[PDB]
Amino acid sequence: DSCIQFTRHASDVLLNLNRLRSRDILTDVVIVVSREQFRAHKTVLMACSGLFYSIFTDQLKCNLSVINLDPEINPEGFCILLDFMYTSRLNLREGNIMAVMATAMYLQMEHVVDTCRKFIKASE
Amino acid sequence: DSCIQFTRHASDVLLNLNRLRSRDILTDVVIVVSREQFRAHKTVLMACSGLFYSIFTDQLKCNLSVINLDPEINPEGFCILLDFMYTSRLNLREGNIMAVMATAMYLQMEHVVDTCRKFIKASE
Amino acid sequence: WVIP
Amino acid sequence: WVIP
Ligand SMILES: O=C1Cc2cc(Nc3ncncc3Cl)ccc2N1
Ligand SMILES: O=C1Cc2cc(Nc3ncncc3Cl)ccc2N1
Ligand SMILES: [Cl-]
Numbered sequence: 446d447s448c449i450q451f452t453r454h455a456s457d458v459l460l461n462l463n464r465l466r467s468r469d470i471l472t473d474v475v476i477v478v479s480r481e482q483f484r485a486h487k488t489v490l491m492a493c494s495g496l497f498y499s500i501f502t503d504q505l506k507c508n509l510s511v512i513n514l515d516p517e518i519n520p521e522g523f524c525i526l527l528d529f530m531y532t533s534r535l536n537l538r539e540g541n542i543m544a545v546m547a548t549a550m551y552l553q554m555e556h557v558v559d560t561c562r563k564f565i566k567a568s569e
Numbered sequence: 570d571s572c573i574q575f576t577r578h579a580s581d582v583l584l585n586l587n588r589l590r591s592r593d594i595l596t597d598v599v600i601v602v603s604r605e606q607f608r609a610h611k612t613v614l615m616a617c618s619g620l621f622y623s624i625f626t627d628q629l630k631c632n633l634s635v636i637n638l639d640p641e642i643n644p645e646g647f648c649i650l651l652d653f654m655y656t657s658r659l660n661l662r663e664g665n666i667m668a669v670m671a672t673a674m675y676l677q678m679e680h681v682v683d684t685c686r687k688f689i690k691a692s693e
Numbered sequence: 694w695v696i697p
Numbered sequence: 698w699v700i701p
């Protein structure tokens with residue numbers, strides 16, 4: 446087509462979605478991790494994760510307001526990934542990289558799994 | 570902080586939100602324009618428009634599944650702006666610029682109003 | 694704004 | 698990935 450494009454649009458949209466999350470506005474699901482609860486928007490979770498995409502496109506699960514993750518999932522790893530989903534920023538540290546990579550593999554967040562694999566390979 | 574950032578994350582999120590819109594997945598509102606209906610996600614509309622932000626933060630309106638726009642709003646102008654919200658791409662043409670700018674002013678989409686004002690000023 |  |  447002959448469209449023009451606003452370079453900062455996608456980033457401004459994500460920034461606003463994160464402001465809604467902060468203020469708990471229109472959040473429609475609670476993700477339960479080892480008795481740690483995280484409120485979020487189903488659409489953002491689906492846009493970021495192959496696991497949430499599969500969950501919320503399921504005719505029965507699409508209507509659930511609570512999703513319980515596998516007990517092996519670490520709440521801090523999940524929190525770091527949820528922050529990444531809403532900001533593009535990943536708080537990757539020596540102390541959390543194993544939990545973050547394991548959580549990203551479970552959530553099916555391929556780009557996160559990729560940078561974790563590379564950061565781990567650099568330290569060996 | 571000491572975060573790393575994935576450059577294409579915001580764009581990939583918006584692309585996925587637009588794929589959900591295309592497939593009518595988890596759309597939670599219908600916007601009615603001169604008897605033309607548009608399905609969308611409330612959170613994306615709020616992230617893009619000062620008008621939708623004000624509407625869906627209202628304690629009564631936040632629960633509506635149908636929103637009727639002012640009858641002076643042109644459906645094509647709205648359609649072009651809805652596409653922009655989900656893609657960052659604005660289909661601005663000599664034949665639609667007046668309707669697009671009027672719709673962007675009503676929706677409170679300041680960056681769109683700005684480029685319309687500039688494109689109009691260039692043609693005078 | 695840019696030409697994409 | 699970048700340093701923001
Ligand atoms: O690594 C990843 C990130 C990711 C996101 C999604 N999401 C969607 N895919 C396609 N259409 C709509 C949506 Cl919402 C699916 C798989 C994966 N895998
Ligand atoms: O031009 C514009 C675009 C736009 C978006 C919004 N959205 C939000 N603002 C702040 N926190 C959350 C959200 Cl969702 C408000 C005003 C305007 N004005
Ligand atoms: Cl990812």
Ligand SMILES: [Cl-]
Binds near residue numbers: 678679680682
């Ligand atoms: Cl705008």
